[PDB]
């Protein structure tokens, strides 16, 4: 069995590298922004024996700014470097945002009569939709167990992008879209709330001032899903949550009381979000109630008939 596994493992690693190399070669040959003279040179060195991950990264993936394949390379190489990983995530998000904005612009010109730039093939997804498509494609290929998904660093960055680029209600997007994304991808509920707590305590920009209203809304949505999950898992077994989650919702209520007060005394006139915040207060209290009941004994009596 040992000799079998060692060969199955060598073939699995070399197959992972080979697919990366094939994805690169195909993309480079098809890229409009690559001169023909270079493409023939790329085809010579990549359509043959499998190359090392260093070369694939330095000589090709990094030169062409294929940041998604850079991340797959950091995964195949067991690359321990959080800072470079996050730099690559930041470049991939920004590159995709600019590409989505460009395609929506070209569209708006068609729907208005103008002419596109020469050699531009004529309702493309909003930028936050194309961005999260990129995150999904990588996650399914790396399985979320990778070091290219440090949720403690990657979730705040994605939330930062949503704020600093208005990927919120103004354009008709769900303001909780970053949370939906990572939950559906299979991030455990406890880890989400744990990170969101750290976002709220440290107050790193842009998560500052009255925009912590949005952080509280994410916490509300995450805890809500967590409660639903626990209730579902209890019914499941008929046929972890600590007091820290309750404390976190209390502080969240205090943040909302602070934001509303500051909003009422702003220069130029009171803030327009008065009832929007009053609603969030009710939701947060409802969640603290549910969490308090579960913590107080209703969680050990979930498999029992009522």
């Amino acid at each position: 069995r040992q000799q079998q596994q060692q060969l199955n493992h060598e073939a699995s690693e070399l197959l992972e590298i080979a697919h990366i190399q094939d994805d690169l070669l195909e993309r480079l040959v098809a890229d409009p922004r690559i001169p023909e003279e270079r493409k023939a040179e790329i085809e010579e060195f990549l359509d043959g024996p499998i190359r090392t991950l260093t070369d694939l990264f330095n000589d090709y993936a990094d030169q062409a700014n294929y940041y998604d394949l850079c991340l797959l390379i950091f995964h195949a190489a067991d690359f321990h470097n959080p800072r470079t990983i996050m730099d690559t995530w930041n470049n991939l998000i920004n590159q995709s945002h600019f590409e989505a904005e460009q395609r929506r612009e070209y569209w708006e010109i068609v729907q208005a009569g103008g002419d596109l730039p020469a050699g531009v093939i004529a309702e493309p997804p909003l930028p936050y939709v194309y961005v999260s498509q990129q995150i999904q494609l990588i996650a399914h290929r790396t399985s979320l167990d990778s070091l290219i998904f440090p949720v403690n660093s990657l979730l705040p960055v994605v939330c930062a992008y949503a704020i600093n680029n208005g990927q919120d209600a103004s354009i008709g997007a769900d303001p909780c879209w970053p949370i939906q994304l990572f939950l559906n991808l299979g991030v455990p509920h406890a880890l989400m709330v744990q990170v969101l707590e750290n976002v709220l305590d440290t107050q790193e920009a842009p998560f500052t001032g009255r925009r912590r209203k949005l952080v509280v809304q994410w916490i509300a949505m995450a805890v809500d899903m967590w409660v639903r999950e626990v209730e579902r898992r209890g019914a499941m077994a008929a046929a972890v949550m600590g007091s820290w989650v309750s404390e976190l919702l209390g502080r969240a209520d205090q943040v909302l009381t602070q934001i509303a007060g500051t909003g009422a005394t702003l220069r130029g006139g009171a803030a327009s979000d008065a009832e929007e915040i009053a609603s969030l207060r009710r939701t947060v209290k409802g969640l603290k109630r549910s969490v308090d009941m579960l913590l107080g004994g209703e969680m050990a009596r979930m498999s029992f008939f009522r």
Partner: peptide, 17 residues
């Protein structure tokens, strides 16, 4: 085994020779 070396590469956007 990966080793990044931004120093000396080959200009991916320039022909050879």
């Amino acid at each position: 085994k990966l080793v990044i070396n931004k120093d000396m590469r080959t200009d991916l956007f320039s022909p050879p020779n």
